[PDB]
Amino acid sequence: RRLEGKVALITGGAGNIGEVITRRFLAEGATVVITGRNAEKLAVYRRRLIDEERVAPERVVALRMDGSDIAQVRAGVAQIVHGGTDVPIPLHRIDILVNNAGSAGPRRRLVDIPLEPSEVQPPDSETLAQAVGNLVGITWNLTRAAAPHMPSGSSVINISTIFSRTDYYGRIAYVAPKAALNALSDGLARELGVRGIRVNTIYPGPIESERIYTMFQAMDALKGQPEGDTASGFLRMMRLSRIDQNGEVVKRFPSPVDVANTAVFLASDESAAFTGHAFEVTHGMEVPTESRTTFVSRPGLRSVDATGKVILICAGDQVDDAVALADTLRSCRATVVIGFRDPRALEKASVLLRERPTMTAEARLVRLDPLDPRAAAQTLEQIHAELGAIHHAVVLPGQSASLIEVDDQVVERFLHQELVGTIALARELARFWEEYPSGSSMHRVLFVSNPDDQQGNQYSHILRAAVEQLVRVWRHESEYDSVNPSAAVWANQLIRYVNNEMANLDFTCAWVAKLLGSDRRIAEINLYLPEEIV
Amino acid sequence: RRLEGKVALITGGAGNIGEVITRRFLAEGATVVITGRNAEKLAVYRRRLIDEERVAPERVVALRMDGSDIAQVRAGVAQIVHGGTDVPIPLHRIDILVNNAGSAGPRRRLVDIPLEPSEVQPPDSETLAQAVGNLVGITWNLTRAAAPHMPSGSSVINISTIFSRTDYYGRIAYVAPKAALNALSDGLARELGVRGIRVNTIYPGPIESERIYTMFQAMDALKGQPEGDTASGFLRMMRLSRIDQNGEVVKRFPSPVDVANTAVFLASDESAAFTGHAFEVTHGMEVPTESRTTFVSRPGLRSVDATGKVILICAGDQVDDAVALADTLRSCRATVVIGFRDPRALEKASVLLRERPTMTAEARLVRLDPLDPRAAAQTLEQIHAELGAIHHAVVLPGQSASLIEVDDQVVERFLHQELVGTIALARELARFWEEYPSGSSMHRVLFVSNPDDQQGNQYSHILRAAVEQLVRVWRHESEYDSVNPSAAVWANQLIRYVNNEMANLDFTCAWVAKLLGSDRRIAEINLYLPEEIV
Ligand SMILES: NC(=O)c1ccc[n+]([C@@H]2O[C@H](COP(=O)([O-])OP(=O)(O)OC[C@H]3O[C@@H](n4cnc5c(N)ncnc54)[C@H](OP(=O)(O)O)[C@@H]3O)[C@@H](O)[C@H]2O)c1
Ligand SMILES: NC(=O)c1ccc[n+]([C@@H]2O[C@H](COP(=O)([O-])OP(=O)(O)OC[C@H]3O[C@@H](n4cnc5c(N)ncnc54)[C@H](OP(=O)(O)O)[C@@H]3O)[C@@H](O)[C@H]2O)c1
């Protein structure tokens, strides 16, 4: 009835939740195309729907498709629209896109996340880069491929997870890409809204499923705590108690049909007024959408003394910004190293650097590319041998328009250089700090965004979301590990791009120096420049 | 089908949106009790449903009930459960409570809001206090009266408005009580969740209805701008374009059925996993849930010079806090007046006050009760005659557990003393400042919350929400009126209760002095103390 005559594409349609979304969509009259990597599991599920639930064979199509590969996505969407080998009847359009597919990523503490295929250890099957492609790359690929074939009034439904906004020890390779997906979905709602295509996000809590109990078992083991501790923490956070199988009003997990019923509402015309909207299937867990504060003053640097602190600035190609940060830190007497991903930027910075009395030497310049982990680890070791430690780090983006009408290689470079690259850098720093203990004084990390791009900062928003959840879990893992066998890491993220004034760089540099050279520590993760500094 | 055999109570069920909620609920198999103040309109609508839509008479019950009167609410709920004169068949329970009733309040700029019945001018029919009772009092009353008769799995659906979070010139008597309702709903979700009763809030945008066009017509007139300007601003804010009656993909208002369809989803078991959740029926208007920042430093007072600034502290009964604020402002050389609602507090403060070199006289003490507007206006005039002006004001709460199991008079005193009282005070200050121009220098107002109540601060959250939206619209009205015929008002709200440390009062006083005595102005409305000051 409610999805009568609509064409739905459900990725991961044979998974634990996907099976229930598929079933409910069929009961409501949709024609469903289910995708997955395991072609047999798709065929078996399709057969069960036909043979045991009296579903007409024309209404279910099984289509193998690795959604992390844009070539496969385009080929599969073409088949759906025009017919093909695996699609017997051309379906002409997609009315509902359920971006439900999502791997679990490698389950490891940040220090242990595998970056290269040879590092992947049995329980896991994915590098960091593969997890990114199977979590946010996949949703991005399907939406770009499908959007030309979705008429006005169509519905894009992205499945994220509430845990993209909570502590989630040992799952940074999962929750940081899912946080990126949240910001991608909000940018897509803005872009597709002009076409009448709505884009909404479901955030399931822990859902009764083999998946959640497998993951919670692994996370209890990663933390060295008893079975059931991860679940107990989230059960306590729920506000809504609910009838369980024995009729008792208790804390319990929501079920897959709860998620499926939300997807039906969003797929149907009953949700026609919603876009860019969150749906938290969590029994009322109180989880903020963002941890943020706004600077309301400029700090005085006269009191800031970083004598004897080694501070590594990790830059991509941002010569002038990196040099300005180094100048400010050096005026506070810090021992500064600047690392550059881009060798041309490194050369340009050497020239620039050659251009009250102070006994502070000029910054050392090194090559530091986190996408070459073995060279990065060696560079950090050489710095430790020469300077004795690395106390703090400043992390800039990896490189200095539309989210849909964009070349495939621009999307791939963004995912690789900014998401994988930034998380890989944090992995390399965390590992180095664990391997080279330097006492109990916290290591401080400041992520700093790019400046305003004059075009809405759509891609910077995605990096911001990923970095916030990287920071949240890194803070928790490092605190926990420092008590239960090592210094903890405190981290924040400075957001420059909401301010477009000439004083922006100077204001940012002053706060970086204040936050690294003084005792002040800020609880909020994201630290925004004000819109007007003066 | 989806509400088969459920008992729904819909307040305002014969209004513009209520009629459509009622109709959809009946189509989905519910038995519906509709309430309103106009008994005839209810009877006429019930007759139309029976005579023109083939609805069985047993399934619709018309019940006149002014939901702002708790006595009437209890009597009507008793009738619904046990049967009575207007309820022929006892219904035994309430499965769905739709708190949809809501007046429009007096439509006036803050300076013109009617406080007393004789001030109400034709277009309007309500004082400020009546509007509060018809907007948040009503929802509070019904939920408390109905909750004992709602079994586990039941659903409370509160209709607020997105405009409780946006600019809305000339509607403070409407949007500030609706903002209070938002925080009341979140506290109720927490309290009722242990019983398995979920509580969710719908935030409609502008909904195609006689109501919205009547209100937008009045708001265009209040601002002296052309017909259609208010609507044009909100149409621009929508992200989702949508098919209109002629098949064009354009900006348009959502319809009443959009709101009704959301209420059906929330009434049905398909939403069983949702509580404390917002549903924004707005075509994706980007509207934050809160304007806030967190203090990340303590300010230096040595540079703060308020010489020649008259600052009025408006206190209820908070002797020690008011005196501490006065001491701090006087050490910054301000000319201080303290007003007290409570005459006993005024006497206690006189005794306390009698208890580097400075030439700053002790604070003047006056009676200032905003619920006696004629005496308040005279007091402000006498201060102006004696001291020459009132530059800035600090506003404390009117008085120094559960939201359900609470005596009726505690609820009534909170609504009257804190909500009506605080808005009435701002009305009195705004009017005084308009009547006694003192140049173009902005008047600054700092609302300051109570300290931590050690019990979750449920009532303080409600006042916080109302004050934030009071501030938002007051800032906009006063800015607009200062350009289009007068000084603008800047206001903020300091939140003390998230911090429970001994340094709390001193830290708060320092920021009050800094924000009133220096040039710094903060864009965010709510200014939170950090959880840890040191
Ligand atoms: N408690 C929960 O289960 C829970 C809570 C919050 C969020 N979620 C989200 O819910 C969604 C569904 O997961 P689930 O609970 O059903 O777990 P699941 O059983 O592991 O399902 C994951 C699905 O994703 C598919 N998939 C992964 N990578 C893919 C790729 N590159 N191309 C195509 N398909 C791919 C898998 O297909 P193959 O098996 O063929 O690879 C599988 O069907 C995920 O996005 C997950 O993050 C789950
Ligand atoms: N564009 C929109 O219409 C819009 C947008 C956002 C939010 N909303 C919200 O939607 C809800 C429904 O309003 P509407 O659009 O249907 O406008 P409406 O036609 O004015 O409906 C308001 C209803 O509230 C009832 N009511 C008011 N005070 C009452 C009291 N003390 N006791 C009992 N009933 C009372 C009225 O009943 P009587 O007529 O008998 O007094 C009437 O049925 C309101 O809460 C409103 O704030 C509306």
Residue numbers in the entry:
A (entry chain A), B (entry chain A): 5 to 359, 371 to 415, 421 to 505, 514 to 562
Give the exact sentences the study uses for this entry:
The crystal structure of RfxMCR-N in complex with NADP+–MSA was determined by the molecular replacement method and reﬁned to an Rwork of 19.62% and an Rfree of 20.81% at 2.0 Å resolution. Surprisingly, we observed an extra electron density that precisely matched the reduction intermediate MSA near the nicotinamide ring of NADP+. The carboxyl groups of MSA were immobilized by hydrogen bonding interactions with Tyr172 (2.6 Å), Arg175 (2.7 Å), and Tyr178 (2.9 Å), whereas the aldehyde group was hydrogen bonded with the hydroxyl group of Thr165 (2.9 Å). Specifically, the side chains of Arg41 and Asp70 in SDR1 were flipped by ~7.2 Å and 9.3 Å, respectively, to stabilize the NADP+ adenine ring. This resulted in the closure of the MSA-binding site and shrinking of the substrate-binding pocket. In the structure of NADP+–MSA-bound RfxMCR-N, Thr165 stabilized the reaction intermediate MSA by forming hydrogen bonds with the C3 carbonyl oxygen, which facilitates nucleophilic attack by the NADPH hydride on the C3 atom of MSA.
Malonyl-CoA reductase (MCR) is a NADPH-dependent bi-functional enzyme that performs alcohol dehydrogenase and aldehyde dehydrogenase (CoA-acylating) activities in the N- and C-terminal fragments, respectively. It catalyzes the two-step reduction of malonyl-CoA to 3-hydroxypropionate (3-HP), a key reaction in the autotrophic CO2 fixation cycles of Chloroflexaceae green non-sulfur bacteria and the archaea Crenarchaeota.
